[PDB]
């Protein structure tokens, strides 16, 4: 319907600002980054089903699903995890977050690998290394469907989703991919950045190819 817009955290426009413009060259390290907290988000609606296994009943199979959408510039990163209510993703991504924001932003003043972010629990904004804007959509089992918007600019916006597929339970991050950085389309590309930093995840990964037949 009618979005709302909220102000993110100063510390997390200038997180995001330093993202998107940085000249860091492992820019692939972004993959990892968003496996890992989809895998977090499975362990705990896992977790919490041990004692609540109706929680699984709205999207039973647990997974990660990587899909490239060529045309749109598009890569989603899917899993099937817990979800965010509308208030978790307003809180979880922009107006309080803080988490070891700052501090990280204080080691990379000092030197630190832009690939040590997931260490200081914000991993999410290392999207913006190859994405210029991202969608946010998910689904947690106390909510409807909602859609998180950021471009990085200091400004974010949530809509309850009237326009994209129905998640059962989860969270897709749609990447709005940055002209030089279509690689991230590719299934060789793809399927390498998964192969050789994400090799201890307990939860099956995915990958969508779309291919002509003959
Ligand atoms: O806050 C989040 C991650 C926090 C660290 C991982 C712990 C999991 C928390 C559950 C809610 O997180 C999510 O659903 C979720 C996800 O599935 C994938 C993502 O890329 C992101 Cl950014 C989030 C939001």
Do not use: C
Not at 148 to 169: K, P, Q
Not at 177 to 188: A, I
């Amino acid at each position: 319907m009618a979005s709302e817009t909220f102000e993110f955290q100063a510390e997390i426009t200038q997180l995001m600002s330093l993202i998107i413009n940085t000249v860091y060259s492992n820019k692939e390290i972004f993959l990892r980054e968003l496996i890992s907290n989809a895998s977090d988000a499975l362990d705990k609606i896992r977790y919490k089903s041990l004692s609540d296994p109706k929680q699984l009943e709205t999207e039973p199979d647990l997974f990660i699903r990587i899909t490239p959408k060529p045309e749109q510039k598009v890569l989603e990163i899917r899993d099937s995890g817990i979800g965010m209510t509308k208030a978790e993703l307003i809180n979880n991504l922009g107006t309080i977050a803080k988490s070891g924001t700052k501090a990280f932003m204080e080691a990379l003043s000092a030197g630190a690998d832009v690939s040590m972010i997931g260490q200081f629990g914000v991993g999410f904004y290392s999207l913006f290394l190859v994405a210029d804007r991202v969608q946010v959509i998910s689904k947690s089992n106390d909510d409807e469907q909602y859609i998180w918007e950021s471009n990085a600019g200091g400004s974010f916006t949530v809509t309850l989703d009237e326009v994209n597929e129905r998640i059962g339970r989860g969270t897709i991050l749609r990447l709005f991919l940055k002209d030089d950085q279509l690689e991230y389309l590719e299934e060789k590309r793809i399927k390498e950045v998964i192969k050789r930093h994400s090799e201890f995840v307990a939860y099956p990964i995915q990958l969508v190819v779309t291919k002509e037949v003959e």
